Amino acid sequence: GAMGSMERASLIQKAKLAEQAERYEDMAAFMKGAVEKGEELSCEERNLLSVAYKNVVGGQRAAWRVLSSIEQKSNEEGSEEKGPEVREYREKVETELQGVCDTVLGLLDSHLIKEAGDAESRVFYLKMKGDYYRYLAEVATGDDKKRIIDSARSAYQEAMDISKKEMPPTNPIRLGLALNFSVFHYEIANSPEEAISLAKTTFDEAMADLHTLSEDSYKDSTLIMQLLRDNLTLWT
Amino acid sequence: GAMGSMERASLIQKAKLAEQAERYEDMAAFMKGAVEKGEELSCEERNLLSVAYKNVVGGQRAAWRVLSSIEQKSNEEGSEEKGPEVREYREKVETELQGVCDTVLGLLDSHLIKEAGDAESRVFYLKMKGDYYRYLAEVATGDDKKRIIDSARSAYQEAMDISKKEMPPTNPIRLGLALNFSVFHYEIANSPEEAISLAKTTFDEAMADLHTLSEDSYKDSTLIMQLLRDNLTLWT
Amino acid sequence: FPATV
Amino acid sequence: FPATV
Ligand SMILES: *CC(=O)NCC1CCN(C(=O)C2(Oc3ccc(Cl)cc3)CCCC2)CC1
Ligand SMILES: *CC(=O)NCC1CCN(C(=O)C2(Oc3ccc(Cl)cc3)CCCC2)CC1
Ligand SMILES: [Mg+2]
Ligand SMILES: [Mg+2]
Ligand SMILES: [Mg+2]
Ligand SMILES: [Mg+2]
Numbered sequence: 185g186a187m188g189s190m191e192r193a194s195l196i197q198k199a200k201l202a203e204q205a206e207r208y209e210d211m212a213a214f215m216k217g218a219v220e221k222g223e224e225l226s227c228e229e230r231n232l233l234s235v236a237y238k239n240v241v242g243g244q245r246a247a248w249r250v251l252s253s254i255e256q257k258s259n260e261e262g263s264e265e266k267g268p269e270v271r272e273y274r275e276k277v278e279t280e281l282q283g284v285c286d287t288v289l290g291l292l293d294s295h296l297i298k299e300a301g302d303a304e305s306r307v308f309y310l311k312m313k314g315d316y317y318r319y320l321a322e323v324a325t326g327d328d329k330k331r332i333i334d335s336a337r338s339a340y341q342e343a344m345d346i347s348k349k350e351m352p353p354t355n356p357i358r359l360g361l362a363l364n365f366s367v368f369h370y371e372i373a374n375s376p377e378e379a380i381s382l383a384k385t386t387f388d389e390a391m392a393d394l395h396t397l398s399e400d401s402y403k404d405s406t407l408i409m410q411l412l413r414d415n416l417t418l419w420t
Numbered sequence: 421g422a423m424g425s426m427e428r429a430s431l432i433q434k435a436k437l438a439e440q441a442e443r444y445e446d447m448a449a450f451m452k453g454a455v456e457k458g459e460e461l462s463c464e465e466r467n468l469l470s471v472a473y474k475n476v477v478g479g480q481r482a483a484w485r486v487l488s489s490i491e492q493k494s495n496e497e498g499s500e501e502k503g504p505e506v507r508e509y510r511e512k513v514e515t516e517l518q519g520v521c522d523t524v525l526g527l528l529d530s531h532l533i534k535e536a537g538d539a540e541s542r543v544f545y546l547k548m549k550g551d552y553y554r555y556l557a558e559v560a561t562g563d564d565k566k567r568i569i570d571s572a573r574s575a576y577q578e579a580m581d582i583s584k585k586e587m588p589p590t591n592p593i594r595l596g597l598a599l600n601f602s603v604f605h606y607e608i609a610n611s612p613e614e615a616i617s618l619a620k621t622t623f624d625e626a627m628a629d630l631h632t633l634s635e636d637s638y639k640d641s642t643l644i645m646q647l648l649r650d651n652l653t654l655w656t
Numbered sequence: 657f658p659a660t661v
Numbered sequence: 662f663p664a665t666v
């Protein structure tokens with residue numbers, strides 16, 4: 185641990201600074217250090233962890249898609265041979281992306297998930313587990329693609345089961361989980377009907393519970409409901 | 421050299437891919453590898469080098485400014501003591517930025533500048549030398565700030581002298597040099613009158629030469645002329 | 657890209 | 662930021 189000599193509170197402070205500076209690689213490293221102190225994370229701290237890695241992997245995924253598209257174009261008929269460089273560089277980015285996913289999955293397995301007893305924390309971490317297996321699935325092409333997909337599905341399903349038992353239908357973690365699991369169904373599992381059903385049922389059950397909410401909670405929940413609607417519009 | 425085993429042409433190909441993927445750290449590393457092959461750079465290759473490092477250092481400078489502002493706020497009256505973390509993290513980013521500047525200056529000194537005999541190449545590299553000393557100057561506060569500023573000034577001045585002798589007043593390298601030297605005067609040297617004079621004289625001498633240009637050259641030159649105008653508007 | 661959070 | 666290139 186490069187961060188082993190730094191105070192937990194200092195790591196969290198610096199993660200917040202890194203976020204303000206849009207230094208997401210630094211933010212992720214600080215948050216990894218904080219997790220490795222061994223104490224459970226607060227809600228705010230869980231958010232910092234998720235924001236940091238979402239931004240790092242998001243950039244990698246975008247780069248990977250650019251390179252994969254160039255590669256695919258190079259393998260079409262009439263395309264002039266340009267040697268191994270496009271494949272090599274796509275592989276480089278892919279390997280870095282896989283590394284980040286493995287790091288996050290590692291933190292969740294050692295030992296965030298096992299120590300998370302409250303619904304809000306356990307669902308949050310299981311959603312992350314699904315998400316990072318989904319990112320691995322996006323780039324998987326070999327013997328293990330099926331197992332990676334199943335790992336994502338299993339994590340999302342456990343999260344769904346807990347969220348349905350323990351959280352109201354407007355809870356933003358529950359909504360965001362459903363949003364992402366729906367995307368998993370559409371983009372990864374080749375199950376667009378399941379994706380659409382999940383998004384619709386989630387949206388409608390949330391709609392029915394909005395009346396229970398404060399203005400601020402209403403804002404939070406409706407934001408994510410709109411994302412569900414946006415996907416439905418894209419898919420139908 | 422991490423890039424010592426890779427072909428020069430492969431490094432240039434991958435720099436171009438990295439640019440398309442907005443992977444500017446990778447782009448810079450590829451271009452460093454290409455420079456270290458020891459051959460002179462073509463115009464296209466000089467542009468790749470400049471684009472890569474401009475984007476890397478640009479991000480660092482933006483982050484440094486965010487952190488410096490937070491630090492300055494922390495040192496005002498009535499500000500609650502938050503410990504050494506803001507200073508530590510600003511220092512971390514600063515040190516990384518200084519490292520990138522030193523790397524670029526190193527490439528220019530070993531051996532880009534000495535081997536550049538054509539006006540277009542020599543002016544381009546001397547402009548870069550001025551620019552990277554200017555970035556060092558932005559963060560300098562100690563015994564060496566004056567010497568760093570003088571190093572920037574000297575590089576820009578040599579570039580100016582060559583550009584005036586050897587290039588037309590609409591040449592985009594000559595215009596961009598003047599633009600940046602003008603900014604050096606305003607932001608670094610505390611010489612706003614010099615900055616304004618340089619920008620105005622550069623703009624007016626370019627205007628008078630536009631009639632000699634093709635449509636495409638006209639586009640190139642007028643773009644940078646507008647940047648001169650924008651600065652003049654900001655400063656007057 | 658469909659939306660995820 | 663004034664403009665530079
Ligand atoms: C500790 C905790 O409760 N974190 C979750 C909370 C949910 C709302 N937040 C958001 O930034 C937005 O929604 C989500 C929903 C789920 C997840 Cl996993 C992340 C973000 C982002 C889009 C609308 C609000 C803050 C974190
Ligand atoms: C090898 C070579 O001639 N490179 C210079 C050339 C100038 C125009 N280019 C640009 O991207 C823009 O202008 C400059 C001007 C100077 C410098 Cl050092 C960089 C860029 C960018 C704004 C308008 C055009 C391409 C590179
Ligand atoms: Mg301690
Ligand atoms: Mg691979
Ligand atoms: Mg169902
Ligand atoms: Mg060779």
Ligand SMILES: [Mg+2]
Nearest residue numbers: 510511514515
């Ligand atoms: Mg320092």
Ligand SMILES: [Mg+2]
Nearest residue numbers: 614617618621
């Ligand atoms: Mg003069």
